[model samples]
Target chain A: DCYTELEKAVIVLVENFYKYVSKYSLVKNKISKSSFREMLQKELNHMLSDTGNRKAADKLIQNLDANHDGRISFDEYWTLIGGITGPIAKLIHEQEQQSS
Target chain B: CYTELEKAVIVLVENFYKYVSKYSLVKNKISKSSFREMLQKELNHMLSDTGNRKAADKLIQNLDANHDGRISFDEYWTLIGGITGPIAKLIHEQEQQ
Candidate 1:
């Protein structure tokens, strides 16, 4: 069966998290501070530019760790994505209105 | 001007929020009347082909709660994330054709 646009995006989103997670570790799907920074620099270089100031990135990281365990979880990851998709949706809406 | 990968993603997120914010005057939800425009424009690439036209309509029907244009964030989540049988999958499967 074919994956829908949303589905494909979902898969890509899930894959993105796993890309940073350690498949060999006993833990299932969690990322460390270092891993998060690395992912941000590599995958998110276009959006968040904080690798140069690791401290600033850590400040942002505090929000992702809902459990306060110093690691990011799947829900946290999805939250980030969900959060990102919202603004873009709004941006598109206005752009459409402006262009029209 | 180009944007960072994350910024691009936020733009998409903002797009979704924009739709929901439209109903803010009366309610906080996405209006059904304009949903087609949302998909056609915001998701043009996802439903690029004409064959997926029906699929787009079907998505609207499945998404529009109470048959009204207003869609809640809860429903919107499913609407956006639950689309596993449409465009993306169709295109990927079409590789055989």
Candidate 2:
């Protein structure tokens, strides 16, 4: 739990995209994923770590760096989290329906 | 690429609560190591699509209110512009500690 890892960074990062993601609709058929990833990493770079927890944040960024392209995109990042429950949940439901 | 699936919610917390609660997979679910797999699968889903990845991550960070690093279930749901039925509210209270 980064609950205590570094509050400021999380606040900075989360607040960045909360607005658009919560309400923004698509334009040109693209979700602006890059902008989102940039927001996440931007704040992460600003976080101050003392010891031990640095890896937690770094490793997180690394994971968020989908495609291993050395960067993260909003689509990649948001979809990742949203997928956790939204899509994954839907996937499981399909499987369940088939079994029943 | 910003398209929404609206279908993959099958394996997430909803399934965790449903199948397990129904007594269908309780005996075989949540083994000693399945927790990490459970979480990783969830994480993979979170990062899988490339459409709104960045925006979603930002929402997740915001939901993990305590800045606990990892997301608690409550945070996850709220980020999706959804609500946690009564039970979710209870679990969230527990996580506050």
Candidate 3:
């Protein structure tokens, strides 16, 4: 069955999370802080380049660990993605209005 | 300009706006009908094997945490997490087998 763009997109986000979890972390479902940082730099470079301060990035990662754990769970990763996407969505909405 | 993951995130956000754009007064929110149609059309492939209509209705109720009738972007984002969670678990189980 053919998947819609939205469905595929959702899979992309989920798959990206597990990619780090499986490869870098001893934990089966959580991403280690180091792995999470690598994933951020590699997967989210363009979206997050402006906020490239290493200190800032670590702080953000710390904040994302909502349960005060050292690693990132799926829910925590989702929250991070939401934080990045929200501003981009606002920009995209404005761009859409400008063109139309 | 964007990575595959960045592009994917854009697609997710744009999908929500696609439904929200159908309404006039509601600028950044999706109504129940639009949300239902979106589940049927855009998400049918992901949600079809599971129960569709009743499941979607229950999802909307849970997503609308503020008790508002419409779905905001934050609410919509939560729905994405909800859908992705089970799908991820299924994929992990399949891979483990």
Candidate 4:
């Protein structure tokens, strides 16, 4: 079950990645404040649909409410992104050294 | 069955990272070599366990083609893992030419 939890955590992180970065066409001169939220909703649907995990998807979406403002934050985005990539970066470094 | 290899690969990759990147309570664990060894071993086990039996066998053969019981880091890096995670590499090569 540990792996399962890790999977969820990593999935959450990956979702956050797509949710924040370039998930939308930047408004030529203006930033869309809703862009991040829209991106998360869209990606959440894709990720859940792709995996056929509707139930888990719903639960996760509900959990990402970090600011308690009924919305997530760019700050929260960093937290999750770091969670997802921090480990993989270590693996990449280790693997590179091993191959040498 | 592309029944979505994405989710499956994600689980394995994420777990691999967790192990290598301190996702565990394991004591003072996860050096580069140790992480790579464990990673290859786990990956091989997963591939062998998956439906890709022949591919897994061929992969092992390729890794050990020099007939050495152990694969050097360069060989492992340049040969096997090189086959994947090569975003910067392929683009860089194209740019060079």
For this target, which candidate reaches the highest lDDT against the unseen true structure? Answer: 3
Q: On a 0 to 1 TM-score scale, where does candidate 3 land against the true structure?
A: 0.81
Docking class of 2: incorrect
Task: Answer with 1 or 2, whichever has the higher TM-score.
Answer: 1
* lDDT of model number 1: 0.54
- Estimate, for each residue in B1-97, the C-alpha lDDT of model 1 and write its tens digit: 3333443454444555656543367433667655566676566666666767676567667653374557755456545544433333343344427
- Output the better candidate (1/4) by lDDT: 1
Candidate 4 structure quality by residue, lDDT tens digits, B1-97: 2122233334434444444444544422333455446545544432333434444335555554343244333333232233222222332343348
Ranking by lDDT: 3, 1, 4, 2
The per-model lDDT (C-alpha) reads 0.54, 0.36, 0.74, 0.39
Model 4: per-residue Cα lDDT over A1-100, one tens digit each: 2233433433343343333434354422121335544543554343334333554443444556444244444334433323332334444345445743
Candidate 3 ranges with C-alpha deviation above 4 Å: A22-25, A52-59, A65-69, A96-100, B50-56, B64-68, B92-97
User: What CAPRI class is candidate 1?
Assistant: incorrect
Candidate 1 scores a C-alpha RMSD against the true structure in Å of: 8.1
Where model 4 places Cα greater than 4 Å from the true spot, the runs are A1-47, A50-52, A66-70, A78-100, B1-97
TM-score of each: 0.48, 0.23, 0.81, 0.25
Model 2: per-residue Cα lDDT over B1-97, one tens digit each = 1112222232234434432334533322332133334334444433344544555544444443342234334344444332122122232344446
Query: Which stretches of candidate 1 lie above 4 Å from their native place?
Result: A49-58, A64-69, A84-89, A92-100, B1-28, B31-97
Query: How accurate is chain B of model 3, given as a TM-score from 0 to 1?
Result: 0.78
**Residue B46's lDDT in candidate 3:** 71
What are the DockQ scores of the candidates, in order?
Answer: 0.13, 0.07, 0.65, 0.04
